[PDB]
Amino acid sequence: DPRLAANGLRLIGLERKLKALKARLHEAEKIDPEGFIKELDARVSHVEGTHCAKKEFQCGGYDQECISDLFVCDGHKDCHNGHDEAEDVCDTSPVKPGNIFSGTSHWHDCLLRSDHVTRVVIKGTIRRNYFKSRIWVRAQIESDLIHDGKKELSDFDSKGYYNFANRRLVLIPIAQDDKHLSVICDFDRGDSRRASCHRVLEGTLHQCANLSVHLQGHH
Amino acid sequence: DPRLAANGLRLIGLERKLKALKARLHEAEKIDPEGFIKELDARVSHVEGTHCAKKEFQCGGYDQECISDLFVCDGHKDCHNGHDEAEDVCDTSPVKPGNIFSGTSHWHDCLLRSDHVTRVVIKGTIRRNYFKSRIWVRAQIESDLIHDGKKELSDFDSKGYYNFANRRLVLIPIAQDDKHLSVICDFDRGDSRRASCHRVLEGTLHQCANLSVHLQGHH
Amino acid sequence: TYKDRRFQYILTNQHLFIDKLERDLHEIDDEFKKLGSDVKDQTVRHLKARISNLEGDDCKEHEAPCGGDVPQCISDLFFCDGHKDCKNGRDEDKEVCSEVPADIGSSFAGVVSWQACEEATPHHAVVTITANERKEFFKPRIWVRAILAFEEEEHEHHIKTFQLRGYYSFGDRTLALGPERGTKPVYGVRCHFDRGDDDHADCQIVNPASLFVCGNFAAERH
Amino acid sequence: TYKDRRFQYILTNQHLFIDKLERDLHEIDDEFKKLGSDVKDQTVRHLKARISNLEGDDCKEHEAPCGGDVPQCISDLFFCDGHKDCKNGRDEDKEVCSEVPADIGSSFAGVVSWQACEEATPHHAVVTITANERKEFFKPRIWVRAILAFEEEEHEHHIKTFQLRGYYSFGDRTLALGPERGTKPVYGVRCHFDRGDDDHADCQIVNPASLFVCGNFAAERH
Amino acid sequence: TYKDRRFQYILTNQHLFIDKLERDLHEIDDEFKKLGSDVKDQTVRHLKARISNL
Amino acid sequence: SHDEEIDKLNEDALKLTHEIIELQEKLDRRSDAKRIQRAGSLKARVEALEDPSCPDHEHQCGGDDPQCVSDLLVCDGIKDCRNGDDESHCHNPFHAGDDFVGDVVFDHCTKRRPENITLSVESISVAAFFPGFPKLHVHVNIHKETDEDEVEVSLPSDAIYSFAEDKLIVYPSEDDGLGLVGQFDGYNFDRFVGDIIHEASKEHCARFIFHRK
Amino acid sequence: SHDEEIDKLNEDALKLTHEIIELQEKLDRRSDAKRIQRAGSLKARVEALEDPSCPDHEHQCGGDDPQCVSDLLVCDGIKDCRNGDDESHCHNPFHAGDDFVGDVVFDHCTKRRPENITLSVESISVAAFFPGFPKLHVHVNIHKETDEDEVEVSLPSDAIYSFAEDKLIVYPSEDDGLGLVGQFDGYNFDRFVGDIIHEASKEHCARFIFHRK
Ligand SMILES: *[C@@H]1O[C@H](CO)[C@@H](O)[C@H](O)[C@H]1NC(C)=O
Ligand SMILES: *[C@@H]1O[C@H](CO)[C@@H](O)[C@H](O)[C@H]1NC(C)=O
């Protein structure tokens, strides 16, 4: 064995290296350039606003064409550039059943709670083939309250819709007169994983709490 | 010395490799992609012809504008795209004095010589600043003739011009009534290194020999 | 022999080890490729441009920013005139002074939302530079002849065409167009190339007199 | 200690050896960089295109080549209509069926050498697509509305504009334009996109009736 | 051969080590040169003379 | 034979080494500290354009679950953010000996109206019991050469750094209300904007862009 | 210490290995045999478009110093070109056992009018005293399935390869004047154009594009 042994050592080295790189993958996944830019595009676009009316959908990013939000993701090309039927626009995964969005609820009205976890749990979706403009969502709203020294879950069943055009999930409490506030989430972070939410009164849309959920998801 | 020695062996390996690559450079220089494509462009463009008159210079490659060849490389932008003053067009190196173009002369008229070496030796150039359209070239034409069992040099002094527009070097024999034929070279191979030449009669431009010179150059 | 087969045995399973390593490497690389990708440089350029526009500048009328690390404002009339007026020379930068937005044959098109003048629904507008002239003694402007045309239905067959003349201003990054000599003051155009390149512009179809906005289109170079 | 300084002595001049190797590598790489470069893919595409054009095809009138490894000719009327008529399907290739040369806002410009009709000296011509329509039941043609305009001097100020209508044919790779409905049969345009991309075309400004060539320009997309 | 390249490998990076040492020496010497200089013998002679006279 | 095969082995091994280091370089490019920084700076500009997410005197912990925390509680060694953000900012951009050179943007209040200002950090005193607001002793160095004279100045001044606001506050040393405030990008730390403000009117009358020298 | 430093050494060495192999890969890409071939094919198309550089029965030695040499003197083992070009072509594209499959371009004379033709090389006989024109025994295999019948055929035929013309000439085996001629690109050798020609009228009545199978 001349320097064949040396080459063997080199090979052990390469094995070690490969192991290390594979380890680096976990840390590499924590960086999403494309997603970062999509987020910034979202936030900047929010600061810009639009020239469209309420209940209207602006076609491109720079584009000047407006469309009724009743025509967004309905299966028909309504924009001169077809943006209203684009895949990013029409992505149905913000309300894919099984999704569990969790976040901290910060109250500043209505209720006198300290900061606490809230989960929006997507339980089901209906999308009529004759009206694809909206997805009808059913979900469970859970809240971990450390009310009286000990912990207690406060949950309720709710129903509403996800509207593609403004990327908004509205959930009002199913037959829950019992002073459970509605929730309104905007998937305005460039993805289908995070949303800026509020606990609101259904009738007036008055915001009683600030809530920011991320998907995390798995109990 | 643990595996430090092994790493040392690796380093000797890398040294060896580097030496080998440096050796490959010579062979790598024998490949000129850009020059190859420039040659093909030249040859194809010759097969295509142009829509310009004689004594005219077509501007771009696809471009439709024609210009008098008295305006080519004269210091004034005459083409809508300035091609008549471009660097490739106005390159003066085909007739840079010191250049020695060598090639094989193949006779088929006038003289009864067998195939033989000819050299065009650029001896001087004059380029008037008041008329840059042309370069006035003075050169020596040498021919190695194996006439009567032994070798003998047949050389003569000559004068003419290089015209940029048609990339043509014309050399007629300086006061050489002594049946020395003129030479006309076209640098039509995409470079300033090779030329397609002819030995011709000055008065009639009748082609007595085919000659293809390349630069090689250094005696 | 036997020793030969031992040596060959060592060689054989070093190549085997190398092959395994190669396979593992391919697994890891494949795992890395499923982490999305990097971003289109145009998307980043445009995003940065939108941010820059939202940030604005402290320039006065008839001034434009030089750009760069230390903000400085200089005159419209000082951009691309061969003398460096910016502390960082940006007013003579080769990119800033790109004369491409005013090149002959340049055409910028997009769909128009009207607010007056025209009662038609959203259609394309195209403005095409047909001629230009940049005087050598006054270089901060490129004088252009252009044509505004509208996309109209297959049934119309009586298209409307407006001949314009105006200029491109480097510092403003502005193409300003008005009616050609003796041609009925109907329309003018204001295009602002503020997306960070010579290929997109925010245009308004205006009244030549009042600069009143008749309609807007997001222009794109085709 | 001493043994420590021996070990450190070995380490020190292995790094030195690595540094030397690095320097030598940089020398060799620098020597390699001075061997010219590779070629622009556009120059190669256009060269290949010019060769292809010089080679021609054995197609009949109203036929166009499918392209590809085994030559086959098919009808004008069979390109990009959703059914594969070529043995290799090329008549439905996504590149062949690029509808970009007929896109709204597309403008092709270049300098014209005239041979009749116009007694002006070489100036630019620009043809701009202002509208289009591709009927879903007859897809092998894109019907277009365009405008031919000429570059004219700063002194003219009475520019000439010709409104055209016609089609783009995929197999022919041809933009064919004639006078718009009721607009004085003065000019027509024939552009052939034969440079291998959607961005350059050989155009002729012709008489709409005789197809007599009035002038030629090498068109380029701006 | 291989042994020849090992011997040459040792030679090569002893010269490299010598070169490094030389560079370091030049650094130190350069650092020493920036400590002013010695004094003109005339300035000292005259100073001593002035003291003597006083 | 026993050399050709070995050489082929060494060759395949080199090529493997190359492919492996290539993967590593992709990994490195993705996580390149400079790139991450630039990203942070961009994000920061956007944040500047948005409405503040926190009350006037609080600090946004950031993250996918935002939270506001008193400015006085940032970098005091006790975690107040649920994500501990208040306790990881804590690297002071200024070290004893650092120089920053600022070039003028606009200026209509300073005495000398200088082209550039050098800010030299001389010392830093961090109270162990109050580490969130380090105190610096710095010198403001100006050198202005007019026609009538040449003036050089080195004004000793006291400063505070706020980790909460990523901000240097340099209290005036002369007899004008003129203080220097350096706002850091949040991610750069080799460049800040130095605004000169009247301690009283709060009027902003000069601005210099400072870079680490 | 004695491990951290060694590891840093191994690392720098790996990175060097990478940079070196990178240079090598540039070198390899430049001289990639396939690329050179494609270049040759392109150049060949151009040459086809140009006027012939040589008399009807001669061979262009090529190079920067062109020369014409009789077709009968190419690949006879004696250098006639000044650059020896006639004696370096000499690699026969056909080997005993090779199959080429040709797809129809046009065809209006063959008996079966087939979709594809397989040409199988069975044997090669090279006269030592005349190596420039190898003789091949090949079989032309056709399989045509119409409505009325299914026909299969394997026609044994004699052929000659001309190195001078880069050309395979397959003499007809049946009772029609129909011969097959395969023209090689000059640089490809995995693809030729197979024209079917009447041995008499010289009329070109069919063409197939053959690829090495
Ligand atoms: C300050 O500016 C002057 C020119 O106005 C320059 O000469 C000097 O070097 C600058 N000083 C620094 C440290 O930037
Ligand atoms: C020959 O052609 C027929 C179709 O015409 C096909 O089924 C068969 O597989 C082909 N053979 C080859 C090698 O192309």
Ligand SMILES: [Ca+2]
């Ligand atoms: Ca729709």
Ligand SMILES: [Ca+2]
């Ligand atoms: Ca000229």
Ligand SMILES: [Ca+2]
């Ligand atoms: Ca200027």
Ligand SMILES: [Ca+2]
């Ligand atoms: Ca079809």
Ligand SMILES: [Ca+2]
């Ligand atoms: Ca704290």
Ligand SMILES: [Ca+2]
């Ligand atoms: Ca021979």
Ligand SMILES: [Zn+2]
């Ligand atoms: Zn923070």
Ligand SMILES: [Zn+2]
């Ligand atoms: Zn001090």
Ligand SMILES: [Zn+2]
């Ligand atoms: Zn040959």
Ligand SMILES: [Zn+2]
């Ligand atoms: Zn047989």
